[model samples]
Target: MERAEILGVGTELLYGETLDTNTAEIARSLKPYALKVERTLRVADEVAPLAREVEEAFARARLVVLSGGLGPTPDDVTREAVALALGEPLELDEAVLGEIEAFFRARGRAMPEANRKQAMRIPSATWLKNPRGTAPGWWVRKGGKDLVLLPGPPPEWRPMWQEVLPRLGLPRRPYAERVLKTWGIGESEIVERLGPLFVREEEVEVGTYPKVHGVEVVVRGREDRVAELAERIKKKLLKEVWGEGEMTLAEAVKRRMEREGATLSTMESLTGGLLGAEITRVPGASRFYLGGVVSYSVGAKARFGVPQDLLSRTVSAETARAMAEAARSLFGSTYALATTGVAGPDPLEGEPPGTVYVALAGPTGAEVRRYRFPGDRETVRLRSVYAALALLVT
Candidate 1:
């Protein structure tokens, strides 16, 4: 069964006392088992309420995993709740009791009788050893469904979950997913290109959404099927598919530069230092991103070595090209990207508010692009930065 439910216990979590990381941890890990979490519930540290929730989850036969409230205190009633839900009685296991006693004895401390609370188990469950803490875990299986209980602390439960993961005996079908990201196109156009692929019955799942760099066509399914779908999508949208799977435009440029043993710098005008900041957001970018110059004013442009001749048209493609070339020589990097634009709430030099130019300079010389985007000052500047990275990657 692919359906799973996550039950998080403890009044602390419900009352905003502690941040519960187990729910997301469980949900993320279960993807390999092809188990989908249909519901997640948080209940206080009370047996009756927890038992009621556990009973419902059990009756549905959905794989249920409960975390928290498994300590050696009276309020830690997860085991009792699960026992009540399973219609079984909790019994002390001498063997497990011995293990717990040894844990305390090895620590040079006497074991408290209350610590024996950690040794009880429901008859139908297997004790999962949690070497990290006093509380052991429980794993119960019936009717092709699984119910798992783990200690409340993150450090203890995380390792115990890993120990019990393989024992669940879930199916081993391959899972694969790809996020095909694109630029310079709308979602409708991408959907049109992948016409039938987007609406296929249900063998695979496809979703399209707008993003800062552009549109994302996310496809997920079995490994082979997803590979075939991704290949087909690539074939149809080869030119528009900028990169794949969470790769930002900056990352794409960085990877290519690394592979080629190349380096780059940037010179910014309308975008301020925004373009440089974007590239720097990726760690280890210093490997290729040599750094940049922000010449937001025409005077600053001249100070950065843009020719006085080109300063006549600072927002033109010629100035953008010059900026890229000068920065390349100034930093002595393999390549450079430059942005010069009217990122304004008003027109600049009689040009429209969004008139912009991006230029790329390399050993093969330069390529310049002019664009007239539509938006406020911030949007125009950001769009200009995106256009520069898009040009470099292309």
Candidate 2:
């Protein structure tokens, strides 16, 4: 089995000035090549120590990916470090230097002499182009192992990784992955329900991730085995499973509305404009989303056509229903969702904190649900937003 390790090279990452996202990005990108990340290492912008770290990683894994320190500055020593680790001299490629100079020329800036360092390459490596930045990457093969160095900035690293990994010729086995997204259920309960299904069997692996929207069960393996387990899990958790893979609750609602040619709107109180924001987060939302209102005060709710008398009830289901109906009528949409709640350490209208009401108004009528969520203000507000989106589907 091919194994890989990642090295993040930066003093900022070590000091927490910047996060090391490259390691995770490289690891995920390697999944298709059947390369499992065995370890991730980070080192400062110095040649000696970075060289030591690289040598250790190279010994442990067949593929080693190092990010950062491939810049013009003196502290950027990833090129030097790799040469040191492989006992090879840095040789300047005039073509690479010419390209770097041309890059600065095109940008109407003089090329710094120090930037010639970026054109230096180790004997064991080939060059990888950096389309979005000055720092070119390296693809190295040494001692029956592979070494790849990428830039730190996401704009440059992402496309380069996407391009370079496929060309590496790393052995790839047939792979499949399914992500089952579920809301309105706790992680422990889902595990209990699935039971021995989570227990690793053969090559198939099941992983549970608790996200803000819901619990996601990720199943990965050879295509046939992954499909079998995913099908069984989907059958057992049908109603709770809202989507698969990267499908979000917002996307799910957008798709459902698109399928029916229905439009939607929102009215938000304690949840502020989060319901509307979530709806519009997905691209192409304008096709099925009319608009919304953040009616935080009684006067504002009344302005939107909420019954003035229901305003006194504050966080009651009646107020929620009125708001939902008002939004639907005001926006002239096929469906409307509303959220009103007490999200605080203090009570609202004598209702305790975390007390919330969500309502959905549609052609049939208005329906409301009461909930007492746990946690602080933020948690309550987020739960209310999720509840409103869930109402549209359920």
Candidate 3:
């Protein structure tokens, strides 16, 4: 019963430039269902090749999941291939066309004539709605096999998969999992603190994945057994967990603001608008987020009222602290977090390549940190941003 295969079709992905992360993420999400992804393929977006690939997938996998190549463009031919395999033609569905039309109207534009290709479907199939994107999906059954056509975009694919796959009459089993999403703790500290938890034994598998946000620990097993295991693990490792699956870092920050009755603004330098983007990612962020600025240059920093006296001492921790405090008082936020640094391939103003500083101005005035990180320019900047959050948490 544990059988599945994935086909990621797109020339861009077949090349080194694009990654078939959709397949990996899909496989990860479906693991709890005991869906073993046997093989994966990265195919180009051409009619003959794509059709041949799907036919081969049909020969191999009972549940074949196809992602990418379901768009309106001519290069998109997943639906066409499916119809061809079934010995049928692509019939336009009125309801699907209405959905496509509504999408264009919502964006204040008329639907392109080329987009009508998206409304095409096989007679034996039903459309799978994608709430997050324009391209919908398809659910098909041929020769008693299940084939799913999912969108390539993670935001669309993830949600659609969650809704549709469960309804395909999969034999239900007792299974459970607990995800421990963490912050303030580096991967080394996590492994050190919970050394035994990292190993696989006793039908319980604990896996650690490095995410852009932080490290994610997932433990999985059968229902009753996993429940007991989760309880034991929770007791020992409870302090490190910020939240469970789907609870993002921004969500954690929003909760902190709500619980403490506070709001914050951020002033950024090397990270561009990344900190601001993270803050705005959560819903209801506007309620407690007082907005932020991307002051990437000295002139931009001065625009936010960093005194000439502070700048004279050079862009050090003290100067970073002034940035936070100034933003806090000027924007009337309860707190402000500021970052400045030589996040570079080369040194900035005599600092090393990865020298960075972050400051927090809160109810207690200000706290500043200096870090010499490792990695290239982007990595150093990203690590610095997260390091700021780590300091805030501590």
Candidate 4:
């Protein structure tokens, strides 16, 4: 596999105001082309440091991908930095300049003179078109090394990178990647259970990522071998496995609900409707999801059919069970989940923060579980939502 390095140029990114998402996109996009990203660097919008970083990147890898700092402002020094690193002089391309002016003219606006800086390119570089933005990309090749510069905005960078990536002549050496997502299993337990198999296998690469929902066991290698290994691993894991690549716990629950011809709803308290929000994040959720209620207040809980007496009591498992059952009855759903907890800077009813209760109610009746997660308000609420989703998935 050919090695590559990524450089993200922006003072805002260094100051933590802007996230560098383009580098991850570049890394993922290079997977199929057999280009391994060996290193990634972040440099502020200063010519000296940016030029030094570019020079070091070219020395390390044959392919260097850069993003950000392609704007019209003076802080946008990526073009100049690349030119300085390569010892190449910049030339103004009249065609590129015309295109920039035409882009503004089409919108009934005049192009700023500063934007002409975007039209400048080095002699050894080819201009990559940017249909969505004013700053075009640059493709520079010199001394058997390739450098690709993309715009900062996601809307412009993603599409332009896709269009120009194939023209780089990277060799086709695709590998199969699969993620076996599972809930109710710790990462350590997974490694322990599969220790013998992993020890026996030396060719395939396996990785484990711990997520809020669960742990993901990612396997990658030759296509046929990956498939066979995935099947073996899945068979061994059995009920612990929820679904495969890109599948969320909520999506897995929705698929099962669809299979069972059931509809679901939620009653949230501490999560503030985050449980419902997560369910609806998946497209076409309405087919299997009836609406939910964010019954945060005592009066709202009573209005949603939670017994007033239950609300008066502590936020206990029984109260959570009643909330779930009441929401199911109110929404006429086949199944309902509920979350009630003290996610607080202050405790409630003699309970501390991170004290949470999640309930799942179905035709068979309700099951409630208590959890004392460790985090602040936001973390507690997030964990509560995930716990409710896991209840349904399990």
TM-score for every candidate vs. truth?
0.77, 0.83, 0.64, 0.81
> Highest TM-score, which number?
2
Model 4 lDDT tens row, 1-394 = 5579998889888777988777877888887665666677889999999999998898877799999998889899999999999899889999999999999999999999999999999998998989899989999888787999999898998999888888888776657888898877787888887875552343466788887677788887667677887777777777788789878887888888889999999999999989999999999899999999999888898889888778766489989999999999999999999999899889998899999999999999999989887788988998889889888777
| Model 2 poorest ten-residue lDDT run | 29-38
lDDT of 1 by residue, 171-203 (tens): 765778888888887888887988988844334
In terms of lDDT, the best-performing candidate is 2
Task: Report the lDDT tens digits of candidate 3 across residue range 1-394.
Answer: 5577788888999885787898887676666565556578888888877888788778776688889987878888888887776678889888888999999999999999989888888877788888777788998887777889998888888888889888776655567888877655567877777667565754567777876556777888667766776666666666666678787667777888899989999888888877878778777999888988888767888888778876654359988898899889878999898888888888777788788888889888899988777788878878777766655554
RMSD of model 2, in Å? 3.5
* lDDT (Cα) of model 2: 0.87
Clashing pairs in 2: none
- Reference-based lDDT, residue 327, model 1: 95
Q: Report residue 275 deviation for candidate 2 (angstroms).
A: 1.5
Instruction: Please provide, for model 2 over 112-157, each residue's C-alpha lDDT reduced to its tens digit, 9 standing for 90 to 100.
Output: 9999899999888899998789988999988788899999888988
Off by over 4 Å in 3: 8-32, 44-171, 201-203, 225-240, 292-315
Poorly placed runs, candidate 4 (over 4 Å): 16-18, 91-120, 127-136, 153-160, 196-204, 280-315, 326-332, 346-351
True-vs-predicted CA distance for residue 117, candidate 4, Å: 4.7
